[PDB]
Design a protein around this ligand. Structure first.
Ligand code: NAD
Ligand code: NAD
Ligand code: NAD
Ligand code: NAD
Ligand code: ZAM
Ligand code: ZAM
Ligand code: ZAM
Ligand code: ZAM
Lengths: 243, 243, 243, 243
């Protein structure tokens, strides 16, 4: 497969419907060796089942709000993977009240803080901690959403976190690039669904399978000439207007 | 002038070199009535002197790091300007260690938090705090930089905060528009300089005059059709390549 | 006014509904001295009447499809304005059959040629023809539309010509900048309308007044730091999504 | 391979160094069945040798300036490929005088015409002619360059043609999307080379091999969720500033 011999860490697998599940699925098909992290114990047994299926034994706990937690997970990972080739950032979050209604009235200092810390910072937080472990030719991937670029109703402060994150992807790529590391993002279509379906050129919303293959590609040597790019896997929805 | 009839609040004056000082002058020259803010004891005496030269005596303190400092300042403002036409938000901050060297090695969870808190959240926190006081036809303005769109060396976490900020401009613009408020941004060229003067289409870096003139317009009714935009006042530096 | 001292050439007036008519008025209100152009016999009498109301009597013919029509018009201009401060290029054209239906089935090799020739090449062809006559501090302005950046139904080949046009603005801006000329563009909202009024942040389509006010500024020294930019005067319609 | 069973037409193979050569190379490796076109007789024997190597027998003549020529080639192609799955547009052109020196002085009406017709129009010209032959799941690919988005010295009018072409890619995708056709572009880094090498994050220019794999991916079902996107395969050069 095109990921044959790559050891990739996969974050964010919460369920079978998770974009991370669709992404691991594809990296696996393409011969990548996977490892997974889980936020808390609620999800341990589940993530362990998913990993077993995708052939890995590496299921490490990791809460991205704690620097120390991230450090710890990279120590355990290190016991089996002294060197690896990148990870998949598929973490995002904001307190619920934040995401409904008028942005200006919904947003709060604490809400803004959490949204940027979990959704934007965690990406560089992890990069920072596994930087010396990464093999040349490694690639880091994160997921963004059109809300970073356009004002979308209800997405509110999650839109700023994603803008921050897309900038993160350009600064990380410029910093890590020289040492053989590429970093990009995939702005996925919504996985309202009806409207998108009708107004999207391909006339259908993407699936974690569509996003999965783009993720696999981007993390593989096939995309070697690509770094710092936010690739839209939304079926073209953002390029059309007034359809 | 084209701002006569406008009561506008100007933040961020720290010196005669400050951008808001150039904005203040221009808004004053065009007929505006201004209110000023100073961050602390250190800057108070300096802001009061300029407000006097500009005919204003509305000089209030405001630490955007405190929601209470914000509410209280707008409460003192209501006592003199029950309603006004918008404010210029020319505040930005990142801890010393942040803007130096390899982005990834420099950035820290807290340097990140502070940079976003002060440079980005402070914008919406202020509109949040004064929404009711705004008149239809009101325009809010912020200041950003190219590092939001591109990875500029050493700008590091500030670039990410400028991205969150430009995203904030869109979401705020979209939410407030219905009540008669427009929200824009000026991505000003750096007021490196020699490289910019050599490669900028107009062949010179921009001045606080250039920036002030544009801010004055973005806050006047002359720009009634412009909302949610990030206007580049950098002499065309960003639209050139390998000059 | 902010344009007093400016001698500016205005093209594209065909009626009181025309965009250049709104631009002309505003540039006149601000102190500008204007020269006008009409495309043909049909429009002559109409342009001459407005020029009279605006205090001008410099009404010259110009078919941008002919390099000779251009040279000759600028030759008659030199006889009254040996030098001037820029011109507004508000010309655009695509053969009937083009802007109707499936883009791919509509577009023809010649509809393409004409659309690009008149809507895009005519911009640089005019600056080419009057370069020597320009004063430092001179600003050139064109009009574009969102269909350049996004695929709008029925806009078809015109979208492609607007893209070539916006690209023309950058290249012209970069080449001419050193001599004191700035070159910008206004991407105006459509002067469909009901959909736009409902989804536009300011909740109303923009007027030729809104557009004129912005053009007047983009052609004044107040915008000295803005060159090679495409300013969106569409009430923020383009920065919103799924409103 | 991921192109197993795809029949793709490849335009623009002029030499071993041609981006089209690097692209066919990769589609071949991935199991695609190729067919090639050649501009004129000068290149027939050569293109026939390249094709033989990549396992095809289909070497059709095609001059994109002639509608009739394009039609003819699709008739011959049709004899062997009644249905196929897309083509690779790797054609670009402008008269030489156009590409050196000051844009404004270099550009001409005829030069502009040719550059847009050959570089931009030909893409839709071909699409138009094979539209009923294309199989659902087909994909069309073209090559663009950063000159479309930034003002690059000497690229002059080629920059406008590419802007036109990038818009073409969005209008074609929106029109053909509903019938199961995706259309995208790859903005390739320069294949000055020294400067790019030093300022590009990956610290090296891309190769036709890097561009080749991205082309293969984009034309394969792996990229199914992608249409109307211009993907930058430039090693991140355009995302960084002032390195
Ligand atoms: N659903 C979509 O349409 C869509 C589209 C584009 C982008 N995105 C982004 O893709 C990413 C994946 O989203 P998803 O749709 O799979 O949703 P999800 O809820 O399945 O995954 C988000 C992940 O974030 C994790 N998480 C939250 N806080 C964490 C923390 N403190 N530490 C570690 N993990 C934490 C959760 O465990 C979860 O695994 C998200 O960031 C999302 O915004 C989603
Ligand atoms: N001058 C430039 O080159 C340039 C270029 C592009 C963008 N900018 C932006 O312009 C804005 C001002 O820059 P400048 O050069 O005029 O700055 P300056 O250093 O003269 O002023 C910065 C202001 O920010 C304020 N500030 C910081 N923390 C604050 C807080 N806690 N509470 C209230 N105020 C706070 C200070 O009081 C200060 O007056 C910033 O957002 C900056 O990022 C400046
Ligand atoms: N009104 C809108 O909704 C709108 C919105 C966005 C962009 N635009 C752009 O604004 C510009 C004018 O549009 P409008 O609605 O004011 O137009 P209008 O129809 O009132 O005027 C168009 C002008 O183009 C001129 N023209 C065409 N071919 C020409 C040629 N051969 N020589 C000289 N002149 C030529 C005509 O003389 C005419 O005056 C165009 O570029 C258009 O694409 C208009
Ligand atoms: N060289 C680069 O760095 C680079 C980077 C990005 C994009 N591009 C674009 O990639 C495409 C491929 O370029 P290349 O570098 O392989 O150069 P090339 O000269 O090898 O290929 C361009 C092709 O255009 C063809 N052509 C010209 N006129 C034609 C016509 N009338 N009909 C049919 N074919 C015609 C030539 O036969 C040639 O095969 C070009 O459009 C180029 O602008 C090049
Ligand atoms: C609690 C939590 O972990 N959060 C919030 C993270 C999170 C964010 C998204 C998202 O980024 N999306 C584009 C979907 C989405 C969420 C949403 C909320 C309001 C409006 C639109 C919305 N869209 C499209 C998707 C899944 C997800 N788990
Ligand atoms: C400590 C602090 O209060 N900060 C950071 C706020 C602040 C930021 C800027 C800025 O946003 N600019 C583009 C200049 C600038 C800063 C900078 C840092 C590193 C590299 C380039 C840089 N440029 C152009 C300018 C003035 C200023 N007071
Ligand atoms: C024949 C001709 O002289 N043409 C085309 C020039 C021309 C173009 C526009 C335009 O560029 N606009 C965005 C409106 C517009 C035209 C259009 C066509 C189809 C769909 C939407 C459309 N919109 C918004 C407006 C006026 C006008 N005179
Ligand atoms: C005659 C002909 O067939 N033409 C012009 C098409 C053509 C264009 C390009 C190109 O689009 N490039 C980015 C390279 C390139 C050409 C060029 C010219 C001037 C400046 C930079 C330049 N770059 C980067 C490359 C190859 C090529 N054959």
């Amino acid at each position: 497969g095109f990921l044959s011999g790559k050891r990739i860490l996969v974050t964010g697998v919460a369920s079978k419907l998770s974009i991370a599940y669709g992404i691991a699925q594809a990296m696996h098909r393409e011969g990548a060796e996977l490892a997974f992290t889980y936020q808390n114990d609620k999800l341990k047994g589940r993530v362990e089942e998913f990993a077993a299926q995708l052939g890995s034994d590496i299921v490490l706990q990791c809460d991205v709000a704690e620097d120390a937690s991230i450090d710890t997970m990279f120590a355990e990972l290190g016991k089996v993977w002294p060197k690896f080739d990148g990870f998949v950032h598929s973490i995002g979050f904001a307190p619920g009240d934040q995401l409904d209604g008028d942005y200006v009235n919904a947003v709060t200092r604490e809400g803004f803080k959490i949204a940027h810390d979990i959704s934007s910072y965690s990406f560089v937080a992890m990069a920072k901690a596994c930087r010396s472990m990464l093999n040349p030719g490694s690639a880091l991937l994160t997921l963004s959403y059109l809300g970073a670029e356009r004002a979308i109703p209800n997405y509110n402060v999650m839109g700023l976190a994603k803008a921050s994150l897309e900038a993160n992807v350009r600064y990380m790529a410029n910093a890590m690039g020289p040492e053989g590391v590429r970093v990009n993002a995939i702005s996925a279509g919504p996985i309202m669904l009806a409207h998108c379906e009708a107004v999207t050129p391909i006339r259908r919303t993407v699936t974690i399978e569509d996003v999965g293959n783009s993720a696999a590609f981007l993390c593989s040597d096939l995309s070697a000439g690509i770094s710092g790019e936010v690739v839209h896997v939304d079926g073209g929805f953002s390029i059309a207007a007034m359809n």
